[PDB]
C-alpha cells in the first residue's frame, strides 16, 4: 500500500512504483465429473400436473445430455502466438483413451475428491461437484415406475428442478461458448469448490493464500474445457492457473506525446515513447506486458500473464531513469500531429496541450485551479478531481500515494526539425540518431560537392 509515482518532464512519462506481482507462469488442469443417469423409458400413463412437470424436467435433462454429447463430438505485435487450452486439450485426449474414465470413476467412489495419476505420467486432481444420478434414480425412478406415476407432494418437483438447473446452465454455457468457457462461471465451479481445489494443488502455502484471497482474478484467468461423456459420466477440465512468481516489484509506465510548441500547424515535430505498460520482475530479468490490459490490478498486486509478455533486462528501468543511457536503446515513435490529449495515470494525470486547444485542471469545490499552457504537463490527484482537455472531461483517480515531479528539459528541444525523421512506429533513439547522421552526411556531401 506504498504506491508512489514519478513524472519525468524530460520525456513526458510517469512511473508508478509500489506494486507487487502474481505472474501466471503455468497451468494446472483439474477434472470435474458429474454422475449422470440413464433415463429408462418412463412407461407410465397419466398426466397429472406434478407428473407432467417431472416429465418436462426429465425431458430437459435428456436434452441437455444430448446437446452435450453433440458438443463433444504500442508494442503488442511482438508477443508471439500460443495455444491457451493446449493442456486441457491434451488432458481431454488422454481421458478419451479406453480405461482412463474407469479409473477416475473408481477413485471418486466413496469420497468426492481424489488425485488420479493418468497413464501418461501426469497426476490430475479429479473432483465430483454434482451427484444427479443418485437423486434421479433413488428418488424419482421408484415413484415413476411402481405406482404408475402417482406423485404425492409438490416439493419433489421443485427439488428436482433446483438440482437440474446447474446442469442446464452448464449445458447452456457450453452450447453458447462452443465448449470452451472463460471465465469459469459459478455454475461450472462454485466458490467453495474453487477453494477446495486451491487448497489441494501442489503449491506453496503463500500461493494457496494468494489464490484464496483473489478467487475472482483466478476465475478471470482460467478456462473450462468440455471433455467427455462416456461410461455414464459427464467430465469437463478446468484449466486453473498457477503463479510461480509472487511478491516482486512491478512498475507501470504511462507515456504521452512530447511535441514542439511552435505557433503554426507546420514546422512542428512530436515524439512518444512506445514501451508503455506493466513491467515486472520474475527471475534476473524484467517481464514486459505491452498491452497493459493483459494484467488485472488489485489493491496493490498486479495479476499479469506471462503468455502475453516479453522478457527484457533491467536496462528497461535504466531507460525509465535516464533515456540517453548507452546500455539500452529506448523505444520512441515520431509524428508531426500536435493533438491534445491526457493520459490518466494512477496518482496523477499527464496533460499534453498543443495547438490552440484549451486545457484545464479543475477541482470540485473551487473550480478551475490550473490552466495548462503549450506543452505536456502533469498534476497530482491531491487538489485535482477532474481534468478537462478540449471538449473531453477526464476524471482522475483518488488513490492515495506520494506523487512526485522530476523537472527537466523536453528532449525534443535538441533535434533540429529540418532533419527529424517524422514517421515511425517501432523506432528508437539510436535508430533516429543514425537516420539524422546519414541525413547530415547527405547534406554535407551535397554542399561540399
Amino acid at each position, epitope marked *: 500500500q506504498n504506491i508512489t509515482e514519478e513524472f519525468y518532464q524530460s520525456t513526458c512519462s510517469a512511473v508508478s512504483k509500489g506494486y507487487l506481482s502474481a505472474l501466471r507462469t503455468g497451468w494446472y488442469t483439474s477434472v470435474i465429473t458429474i454422475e449422470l443417469s*440413464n433415463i429408462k423409458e418412463n412407461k407410465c400413463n397419466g398426466t397429472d400436473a406434478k407428473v407432467k412437470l417431472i416429465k418436462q424436467e426429465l425431458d430437459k435433462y435428456k436434452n441437455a445430455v444430448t446437446e452435450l454429447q453433440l458438443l463433444m463430438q504500442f508494442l503488442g505485435f511482438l508477443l508471439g502466438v500460443g495455444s491457451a487450452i493446449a493442456s486441457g486439450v491434451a488432458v481431454c485426449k488422454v481421458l478419451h483413451l*479406453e*480405461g482412463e474414465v*474407469n*479409473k477416475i*470413476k*473408481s*477413485a471418486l*467412489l*466413496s469420497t468426492n475428491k481424489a488425485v488420479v*495419476s493418468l*497413464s501418461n505420467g501426469v497426476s490430475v486432481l479429479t473432483f465430483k461437484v454434482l451427484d444427479l444420478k443418485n437423486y434421479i434414480d433413488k428418488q424419482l425412478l421408484p415413484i415413476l415406475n411402481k405406482q404408475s406415476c402417482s406423485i404425492s407432494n409438490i416439493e419433489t418437483v421443485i427439488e428436482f428442478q433446483q438440482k437440474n438447473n446447474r446442469l442446464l446452465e452448464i449445458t447452456r454455457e457450453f452450447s453458447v461458448n462452443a465448449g470452451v468457457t472463460t471465465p469459469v462461471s459459478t455454475y461450472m465451479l462454485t466458490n467453495s469448490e474453487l477453494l477446495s481445489l486451491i487448497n489441494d494443488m501442489p503449491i506453496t502455502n503463500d500461493q494457496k493464500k494468494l489464490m484464496s484471497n483473489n478467487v475472482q482474478i483466478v476465475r478471470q484467468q482460467s478456462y473450462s474445457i468440455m471433455c467427455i461423456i*462416456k*461410461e*455414464e459420466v459427464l467430465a469437463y477440465v478446468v484449466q486453473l492457473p498457477l503463479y510461480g512468481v509472487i511478491d516482486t516489484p512491478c512498475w507501470k509506465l504511462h507515456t504521452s506525446p512530447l511535441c514542439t510548441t511552435n505557433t503554426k500547424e507546420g514546422s512542428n515535430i512530436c515524439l512518444t515513447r512506445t514501451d508503455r505498460g506493466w513491467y515486472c520482475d520474475n527471475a534476473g530479468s524484467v517481464s514486459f506486458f505491452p498491452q497493459a490490459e493483459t494484467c488485472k490490478v488489485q489493491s496493490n498486486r498486479v495479476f499479469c500473464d506471462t503468455m502475453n509478455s516479453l522478457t527484457l533486462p533491467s536496462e528497461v528501468n535504466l531507460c525509465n531513469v535516464d533515456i540517453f543511457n548507452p546500455k539500452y536503446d529506448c523505444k520512441i515513435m515520431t509524428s508531426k500531429t500536435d493533438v491534445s490529449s491526457s493520459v490518466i495515470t494512477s496518482l496523477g494525470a499527464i496533460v499534453s496541450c498543443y495547438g490552440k486547444t484549451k486545457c484545464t485542471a479543475s477541482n470540485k469545490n473551487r473550480g478551475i485551479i490550473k490552466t495548462f499552457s503549450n506543452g505536456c504537463d502533469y498534476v497530482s490527484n491531491k487538489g485535482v478531481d477532474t481534468v478537462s482537455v478540449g471538449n473531453t472531461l477526464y476524471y482522475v483517480n483518488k488513490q492515495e500515494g506520494k506523487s512526485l515531479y522530476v523537472k527537466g528539459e523536453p528532449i525534443i528541444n535538441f533535434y533540429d526539425p529540418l532533419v527529424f525523421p517524422s514517421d515511425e512506429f517501432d523506432a528508437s533513439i539510436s535508430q533516429v540518431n543514425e537516420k539524422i547522421n546519414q541525413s547530415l552526411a547527405f547534406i554535407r556531401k551535397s554542399d561540399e560537392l
Partner: antibody
Amino acid sequence: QIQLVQSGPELKKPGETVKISCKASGYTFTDYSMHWLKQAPGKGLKWMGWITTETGEPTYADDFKGRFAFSLETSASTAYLQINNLKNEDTGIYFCARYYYGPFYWGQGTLVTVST
Amino acid sequence: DIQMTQSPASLSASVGETVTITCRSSGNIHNFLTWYQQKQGKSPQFLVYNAKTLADGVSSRFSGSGSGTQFSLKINSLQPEDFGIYYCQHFWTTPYTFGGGTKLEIK
C-alpha cells in the same frame, strides 16, 4: 440389474469357423465398450481386447491377433466374436465383459471345445 | 506389460482362521486393483472395487490393502462360502493381466 447373457456351448472341428455372441441388457449399450476375456483349462485368465460400441473399431491383445474378429449390432444391443480357423489350442471358455466401477462384469461362459 | 504374481499358489485353511493373499505387481499400479473369486464353474465375481474400498454386497470379512507394488487381500474368517479360486487383476493400463490364481481348500 446389469446383465450380459452369452451364447450356448459348442463343439467344432479344427479348421472351422465359430461365432460366439453376447447380449447386453440393463444399460445403454452405447455407453461402455465391451471387453472379451479368454479362460483356459488349468491356465490363467487372459484378456484379449475390446470393441468400441460407437464406431465398432476393435483392438486386440498381442496374443490374440490375426484371426479373432470382434463385431456388434448396435440396434440389437449385442456384440459377438468370431474365431476363424479353429485349432486344438483355441479350446476353453470365452467371456464378454464391460467396465464396472473398478472391476469387470462377467457373463456366463461359452465352453468352446475343438476336437476331431 | 505389467505382469502380476501371487505368492500362495496353493492354500489350505480351517473354517475359522484368518487367511491373507498377496499380489506383487511388476510395475507401479498406484492404487488400481481388484480381487475376483470363481466358484465351482461360474464367472469370476469381484470382491473389491479398488485396493481398499471393498464392493457392496460382499461380507465385511474381506479387507484389501496395499498401494503401488504390494497388495493384500485378507479373509478375516472362513466359511463354507469363502472357498474357490482367487485372482487379482490390475486395471491401470492395457493390456490387463491376472495373477496366477490362488486355490483355497479345506484344511
